Amino acid sequence: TLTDRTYLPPLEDCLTGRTVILSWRLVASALEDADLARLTSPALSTFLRDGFVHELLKHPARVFEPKDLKQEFETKTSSIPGVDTIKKDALWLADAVAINQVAALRIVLIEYQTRAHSHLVLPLSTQDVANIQEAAGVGDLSLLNPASAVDAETMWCDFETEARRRERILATYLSERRSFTAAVDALVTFLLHSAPGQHKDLDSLRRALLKDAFAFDEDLDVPDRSKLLTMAPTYMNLVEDCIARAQALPAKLGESFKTEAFELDWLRTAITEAVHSLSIAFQALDLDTPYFAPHELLSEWFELMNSSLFLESILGFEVVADLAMPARSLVSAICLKMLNIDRTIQFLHDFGEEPYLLSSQTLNKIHTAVTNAVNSGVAASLPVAFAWSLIVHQMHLGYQERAERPYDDFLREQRLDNDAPVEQIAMLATSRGQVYQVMSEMALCLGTTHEAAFRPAVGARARLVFQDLLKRSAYLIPYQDEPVFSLLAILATGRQYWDVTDALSASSLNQVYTDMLDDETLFTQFTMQAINRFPYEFNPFSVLCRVLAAALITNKDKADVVTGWLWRTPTLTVDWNPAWDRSYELCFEDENTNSFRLTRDVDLFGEERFIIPEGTLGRFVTDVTARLEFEHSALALLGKRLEVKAAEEICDSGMAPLDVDEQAEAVAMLATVLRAESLKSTAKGGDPEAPLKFLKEASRLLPHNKDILTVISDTIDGLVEKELLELDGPQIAVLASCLQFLHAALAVCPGRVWAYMSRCALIAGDARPGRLSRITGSLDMYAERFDLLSSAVKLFAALIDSAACSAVPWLGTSEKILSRVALAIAQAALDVYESTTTWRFRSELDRSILVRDVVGLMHKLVVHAHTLSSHLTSTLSPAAAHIISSFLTPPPSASSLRFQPLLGTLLVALITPRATLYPGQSRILAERVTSVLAFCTSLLRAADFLGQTHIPLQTHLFQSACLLARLPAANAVYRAPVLELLRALVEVAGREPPSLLGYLGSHAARSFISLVEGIDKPFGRVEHAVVTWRFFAAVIRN
């Protein structure tokens, strides 16, 4: 009793617009975003609760697989306005690409319902280009498209031809292939790894899917995971199909349509399906984490890794590089998951499914692919190969132990009963730390940063296999830089201070971090090793405190770990100063131990000082440093090391001074832990004075008139003695960290931070021009420089918040101070904003972050336009007037300059290809565009409120209307923003006004009003419906 009544609405409703088809593109978007309003809307909620859809999820071939469905197709098309063309295209497509008629019919109807969208994403016409050329302004990165643009009418006629329509249908077909795998991918995550506190309705939908579609009833003490686990072999078999399709285009399709643009789309589609298929299969295997997989699955899988060299046959082209890393990362991850090195080796030592070790067949299958991959040169296979070497190395042991008076068959088969060749792999992998750098790059790909290709949950659970690999090799490999920086990369994934959050996620997702404390092998061989070598080896311990402090904000049982390391540090490891050679004496216990004892007090940095007591037992680690057994406060000590480093005070008889690198890491580590302590302090059951205590301990054993915050202040002042152009890389990194520390301290000492900013050279004063304003120009925004300005904008923004939030701790400030500092911030912000036109960013994503945060900052000030009355001023009034007056009523050259970042944002939004991976990059871009649109809207509203008649921004936006009308076609997220802006624009101009539709053009106007005439049709969200109608009521005159 399973029908497609919901999956595919009746044909007449699709052609009239009464019912929009829930394309997999729409379904995937809602699931990737876990949007409450979309997923719990009746339309999409019924779609997901439907039994027919469920069978498609579990049987993915059926979605497009060809089959005899002529009767169903004829009944759906017979007896119902253009149906002749619809029925025609569906049959042509079904035969061309070998898909069943019903599936093809759905593709053709999606193209028909998205025809107004496809028209608006066409290259701009000659007229539109001229309009935006004037919007650019009088001035001369926002490099515009070429002059190949033609008349709008010419394009429309071409857009309606059978040839183009067929191309869009083919494009839609491939788009739905990608979006279906993606929707299932996101679906699995939504089901297995949703965050606690989920909304009631959303939780009901999650449980109803697990129970009805997978017989997974959470109300049971142990639910049945059978149907979920079958998703792995299901979608593993789909990965094989993608390999085949990528190597063979459709047979019957005509060469008219087999253009280079289609060949690439066909290839990228196959890779994308494989990645999301790998992501689905991995999450499925992960559900059964401790247990082994059926040996037949590995045998089948590694047989495919052999013929395709772990999918390298598909990823050989450079045009698929952005998809290659995601694929390689999950191929390596999913291979390691099945091998299960931890439970494999543990089974070899000690005595569900049977381990694949008991099947000499599978062991040969694996060894063939591994051997083939290494000899071929597959760099991505080293983590799998290195993992396979350690397994064979232990099998070689278990065989010799019994040679004194199933896998044995494999050892005798592959010349392993006796010597060596396996060791060649273990060396090629670790030679020059290759395998360790591979895992470090796969960590980022599977990371938490906004540059990760996959969602957090997939990355969190997947990085565990690379952690298990290091776990088992830790006892057999010495503690070195390569196997340690690799783990730190697996843990940190290049995260920064700004990525700290008290957001509670699924419990199982923090296992990679809690295993550093719960797993003996990792805890003793990595965590303790990092502690016992600090501060001689600075970074390893600093990163752990920085990472675990941010990851355990929500963990009660482990809330005192990092603080327990900073307070009450057990040991101290420093480079030995010859000046102490008279203050120790060996113990003569063991000739190898080399232990000793102190005979005189040692004064580091040689009131309240830091002294290592006489009679403290110690030990010399290497002769080519000493690990003293001395419990102390590494936080208090570090605070003093920063004070010394800031003052440039040499201490011949004391410990070594902080390196400039160590300095930046040190401050960043303090800012993170402080931020983590102030986040948990305001939570239920936390110590509300936790951050103050953290500052006091770091201020201990400092001069009486000096606390840790004074040191950071002095450090900033000292570095800005020169100008930013003269500073060095690591020095600029120190500034960034110091600004991140002010941000964390702002939450607990607002009066101190504000007090310092009033005399900070970075921003202008009533007597100084400001240092930041000097960095503007044509410089390049590379990592150290960008981190500085990014952190500066975020800090400036956080300050504006505290000024507005405070309606009445703050000792050391006044209204004059906040006013002047806020105004200087407004001036610095606008300078950074104007400079984004000329700076060279490492990546457009970097510019999207900066423009997002700067625009947000200036927006916070534009919102205070209501305070611009004589008897209603506030501390933000001057700052607000500086922004408002700079965008409203500026002269031409400045008007053009201040509009290009906005125009550049609109352009980047239209030329950025849609994607189902890299969700973080996509979100950031949307936040950028939404900021620009909202910022422009409030400026127009503020102009109307303040009486400003002549507004260049009004003219700038009309000439950019051709871009605004196309944004909702590029991404539905922009529909409501664009409509609220166009409404504000029309309303403000109305007070013979300009014609919105006159600027768009006859053709664009028609398709735009068509898109907007959907009125959030598929979902029917109230807030979206009201926005649409206020727009129609204000813009479209009956």
Curated annotation (Swiss-Prot):
Enumerate the UniProt keywords alphabetically: Membrane, mRNA transport, Nuclear pore complex, Nucleus, Protein transport, Translocation, Transport
**Family as reported in the entry's similarity comment:** Belongs to the Nup188 family.
What topology does the record note for this protein and the membrane? Peripheral membrane protein
Molecular functions per Gene Ontology = structural constituent of nuclear pore
GO BP terms: namely: mRNA transport; protein import into nucleus; RNA export from nucleus
The gene is: NUP188
Full protein name = Nucleoporin NUP188
Protein purpose = Functions as a component of the nuclear pore complex (NPC). NPC components, collectively referred to as nucleoporins (NUPs), can play the role of both NPC structural components and of docking or interaction partners for transiently associated nuclear transport factors. NUP188 probably plays an important role in NPC assembly and organization.
Lineage: superkingdom: Eukaryota
Q: How does it assemble?
A: Component of the nuclear pore complex (NPC). NPC constitutes the exclusive means of nucleocytoplasmic transport. NPCs allow the passive diffusion of ions and small molecules and the active, nuclear transport receptor-mediated bidirectional transport of macromolecules such as proteins, RNAs, ribonucleoparticles (RNPs), and ribosomal subunits across the nuclear envelope. Due to its 8-fold rotational symmetry, all subunits are present with 8 copies or multiples thereof. Part of a tetrameric NUP188-NUP170-NIC96-NUP53 module.
Its cellular-component GO annotations read: nuclear membrane; nuclear pore inner ring
- Cellular localisation: Nucleus, Nuclear pore complex; Nucleus membrane
